[PDB]
Each structure stands twice: as structure tokens, then as C-alpha cells.
């Protein structure tokens, strides 16, 4: 498996005026998607007499 990542946009309201920004930050959000790989096979078997016919 392999994991891909996405970073969500920031949608917080701006801290306007002289209001303090420390501590009042925004929690950035991330998402992950795990993709699994698997083995797919297919075979055909032919008899000798069938090949001759």
C-alpha cells in the first residue's frame, strides 16, 4: 500500500485589530488516502491433442 496526502485550505476568520494572535492560531487539517496493490492473474491451458486437432 501507498499513502497520498491532501492539505485542506484555511477558512478561519482573520484576527482583526490589535487582538493577540499567539495561542489563537488555526489547526491546519490534513487528509490521507491509502491505496492497496494486489496481484491479478489469468492463464489459458491447452492440451497437446487439442493443439494437434
Partner 1 sequence: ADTTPATGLVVQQWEDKFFQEYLHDGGFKALMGTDENAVIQVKEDLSKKAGD
Question: Partners of 33 in the beta sheet?
Answer: 4
Least Å from the CB of residue 52 to partner 1: 6
Which of 1, 3, 2 lies closest to 32 in space, CA to CA? 3
CA pair distance 38, 31, nearest whole angstrom: 23
Whose Cβ is closer to partner 1: residue 18's or residue 49's?
A: 49
- 53 touching partner 1, by CB under 8 A: yes
Whose Cβ is closer to partner 1: residue 32's or residue 52's?
A: 52
- 48 touching partner 1, by CB under 8 A: no
Amino acid at each position: 500500500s501507498i499513502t497520498i496526502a491532501l492539505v485542506n485550505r484555511l477558512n478561519n476568520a482573520a484576527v482583526t485589530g490589535a487582538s493577540t494572535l499567539e495561542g489563537n492560531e488555526e489547526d491546519m487539517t490534513s487528509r490521507s488516502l491509502r491505496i492497496y496493490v494486489d496481484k491479478r492473474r489469468n492463464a489459458v491451458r491447452i492440451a497437446e491433442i487439442s493443439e494437434q486437432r
